[PDB]
Design an enzyme around this catalytic site. Structure first.
Site, PDB file in Angstrom:
ATOM      1  N   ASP A   1      31.707  27.958 -11.356  1.00 39.45           N
ATOM      2  CA  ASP A   1      30.729  26.887 -11.261  1.00 39.45           C
ATOM      3  C   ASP A   1      29.538  27.368 -10.505  1.00 39.45           C
ATOM      4  O   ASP A   1      28.430  27.113 -10.866  1.00 39.45           O
ATOM      5  CB  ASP A   1      31.357  25.680 -10.507  1.00 39.45           C
TER       6      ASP A   1
ATOM      7  N   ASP B   1      33.380  28.693 -16.771  1.00 37.50           N
ATOM      8  CA  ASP B   1      32.731  27.411 -16.624  1.00 37.50           C
ATOM      9  C   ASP B   1      31.343  27.556 -17.215  1.00 37.50           C
ATOM     10  O   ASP B   1      30.785  28.683 -17.224  1.00 37.50           O
ATOM     11  CB  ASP B   1      32.639  27.052 -15.187  1.00 37.50           C
ATOM     12  N   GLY B   2      30.849  26.462 -17.801  1.00 35.03           N
ATOM     13  CA  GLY B   2      29.485  26.407 -18.285  1.00 35.03           C
ATOM     14  C   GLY B   2      28.759  25.279 -17.542  1.00 35.03           C
ATOM     15  O   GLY B   2      29.414  24.285 -17.198  1.00 35.03           O
TER      16      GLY B   2
ATOM     17  N   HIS C   1      39.829  17.844  -9.820  1.00 35.40           N
ATOM     18  CA  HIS C   1      39.590  19.242 -10.078  1.00 35.40           C
ATOM     19  C   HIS C   1      40.184  20.091  -8.988  1.00 35.40           C
ATOM     20  O   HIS C   1      39.632  20.371  -7.904  1.00 35.40           O
ATOM     21  CB  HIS C   1      39.238  19.782 -11.500  1.00 35.40           C
TER      22      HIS C   1
ATOM     23  N   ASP D   1      37.300  24.265 -17.345  1.00 39.98           N
ATOM     24  CA  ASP D   1      37.184  22.875 -17.008  1.00 39.98           C
ATOM     25  C   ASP D   1      36.853  21.900 -18.237  1.00 39.98           C
ATOM     26  O   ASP D   1      36.817  20.647 -18.113  1.00 39.98           O
ATOM     27  CB  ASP D   1      36.071  22.933 -15.987  1.00 39.98           C
TER      28      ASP D   1
END
Length: 155
Positions: free
Chosen positions: A133, A9-10, A123, A69
Site C-alpha cells: 500500500d 496492492d494497487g 484488514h 486486498d
C-alpha cells in the site's frame, strides 16, 4: 517448485486518476520490492496489474502464496474468468469485457504456477500488505508520467 510469497496492492488517486501498484515478494530469506505508476488509470486496473507484473517476473513455474486486498480480482479468479472464456470474453451485452487486456494476462500468467490465492480480511494482513500500500500510494502520488496504454476512455 520454489515457494514464493507474493503480496500486492494497487491504488489510484481518482477514478480515473494517477495510479500505482506495489509488490513484495519473499523467497527464503530474500525480499524483493517492485512498484510503478501511471498517469491515468483506475484502482481496478492497478489491482490487476500488480499480480500480473509479479507473476510475469517469475522465471520458471513456482508454488506461490499470493495475497491481495482486491475483491474485484478475487471475483475474477473465482467466478468471472471461467464464464468469460466460454463467452468469447464478451459480456452479456455482447461487447468486450472491461479490462479484458489485463484479465487475459492474469489468466495466462496464473496458469503456469501452483497458486494459493489469499485475500486480506479487512484488514489484518501481514506487514508486507502495508508495505505494498505504501509503495503503491507513493508511486501514484509522484506525478507519474508513464501511460497505461490499455486504460480506455469513459473507463
Amino acid at each position: 517448485l520454489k515457494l514464493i510469497h507474493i503480496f500486492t496492492d494497487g491504488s489510484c488517486l481518482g477514478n480515473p486518476g494517477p495510479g500505482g501498484y506495489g509488490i513484495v515478494m519473499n523467497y527464503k530469506g530474500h525480499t524483493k520490492e517492485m512498484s510503478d505508476g501511471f498517469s491515468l488509470t483506475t484502482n481496478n486496473r492497478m489491482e490487476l496489474l500488480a499480480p500480473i507484473v509479479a507473476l510475469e517476473a517469475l522465471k520458471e513455474p513456482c508454488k506461490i502464496i499470493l495475497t491481495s486486498d482486491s475483491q474485484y480480482m478475487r471475483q475474477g479468479i473465482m467466478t468471472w474468468i471461467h464464464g468469460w472464456k466460454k463467452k468469447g470474453w464478451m459480456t452479456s451485452n455482447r461487447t468486450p469485457v472491461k479490462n479484458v487486456d489485463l484479465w487475459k494476462r492474469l489468466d495466462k500468467a496464473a496458469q503456469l504456477h501452483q497458486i494459493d490465492w489469499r485475500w486480506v480480511k479487512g484488514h489484518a494482513g501481514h506487514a508486507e500488505n502495508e508495505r505494498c500500500d505504501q509503495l503503491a500510494r507513493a508511486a501514484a502520488e509522484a506525478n507519474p508520467t508513464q501511460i497505461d496504454t490499455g486504460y480506455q476512455a469513459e473507463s
